[PDB]
Write a protein that binds this DNA or RNA. Structure first.
Length: 74
RNA sequence: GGCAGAAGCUGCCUCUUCGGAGGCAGUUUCUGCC
């Protein structure tokens, strides 16, 4: 089961399996004449997730909902 | 003695091609390493 959000729990699992921490990247290759958005990509060992936001502390939190379903914590 | 990771609730700033973008804190909780 769980006792935390998909974000704090994900960060906490990496420390319990004698690993370190996740790794995160900014994409934002977008450039449409009437649409823009933040776009984030994270990696946890052999798999990745994506999310969007309005700053570097708000895109990271939206991808978290997928970060368990990508490596086997669904 | 020193180092590392994340968020619940609440609050703030700057830019805007008028699509929207860029950025933070306060308060409270959990975890790892030498």
């Amino acid at each position: 089961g769980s006792h935390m959000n998909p974000i704090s729990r994900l960060a906490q699992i990496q420390q319990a399996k004698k690993e370190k921490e996740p790794e995160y990247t900014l994409l934002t290759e977008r450039g449409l004449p009437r649409r823009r958005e933040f776009v984030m990509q994270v990696k946890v060992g052999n798999h990745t997730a994506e999310g969007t936001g309005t700053n570097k502390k708000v895109a990271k939190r939206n991808a978290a909902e997928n970060m368990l379903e990508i490596l086997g914590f669904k």
